Amino acid sequence: YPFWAQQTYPPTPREPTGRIVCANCHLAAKPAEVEVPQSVLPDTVFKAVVKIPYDTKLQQVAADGSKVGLNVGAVLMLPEGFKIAPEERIPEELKKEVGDVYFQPYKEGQDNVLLVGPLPGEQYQEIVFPVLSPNPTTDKNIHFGKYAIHLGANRGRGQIYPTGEKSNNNVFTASATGTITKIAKEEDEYGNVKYQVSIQTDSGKTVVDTIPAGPELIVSEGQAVKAGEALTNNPNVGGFGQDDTEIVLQDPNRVKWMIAFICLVMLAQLMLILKKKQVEKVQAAEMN
Amino acid sequence: TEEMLYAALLSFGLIFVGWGLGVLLLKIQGA
């Protein structure tokens, strides 16, 4: 949940290392992608596409252990001055691609950092951002140039709640060293299906590791493989990944002059070659 | 890598475009 980043990390979603703190709970890893134009003009609505790809027909494990679909969600960090374009400056063809997305600023006075999610994964494989470029003419804080854009996108449920406890989407280990005995389902009406794991022999050491429903069971009976055995397998099918790109807040006046200079160079190059052609005429008249 | 291969093809291809353009200019004047 993108708003859980706000609850746990209020000032910024991005560590000095550029880790994008979403990974602190979403321990999985799947590819993410952000596609913006190479260069945009000042005060111009453009399209920022965020791709959060995965198998459209694949389900995960819910809190009840039930098989449910996946919801996507991402955090996009735009350069200073950039923000979601006003609703009246978005063309009809663009609004269609965007959808019912709820673009949410990370905190008060930070419209360049946006939160999105949870959104239906089967429908929002990619997310279209209606971004409005800033204007260095009306703002003396914004400059023309090349700036960086950061993205952190996620699929499926997380592994750790903000409280600190684990969930039913990762694996489970063992306490110490001992042999198991009873494996059944201690289910409740107000709760859900559990699984009891016993520990015995060695020296003393009688304990029980209760594991929630969801994960598989690749352990049959009577085992004692140290402490840290994955007796539950990994039910995680989601994934969090990152991507980075560069957009250039280009000034049209800088391009126009560049074209003019390039034209001067080409024209001057031509005059030199034509000049050599004139010299080649004279030299052929004095060879003999 | 979208911007990469796009630039790779252009930088490679436009050399021949300029090469041929120069040869064509030579035939016009009569090399």
Binding site: M266, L267, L270, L274, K277, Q278 | L21, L25, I28, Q29
Partner: peptide, 28 residues
């Protein structure tokens, strides 16, 4: 796409100048 059109027009305009001037200099 649009750049391919600009690229063709751009070069052709200067190519015309090249072939244009070379005949203006020869005929004078």
């Amino acid at each position: 796409i649009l750049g391919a059109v600009f690229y063709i027009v751009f070069i052709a305009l200067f190519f015309g100048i090249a072939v244009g001037i070379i005949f203006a200099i020869k005929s004078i």
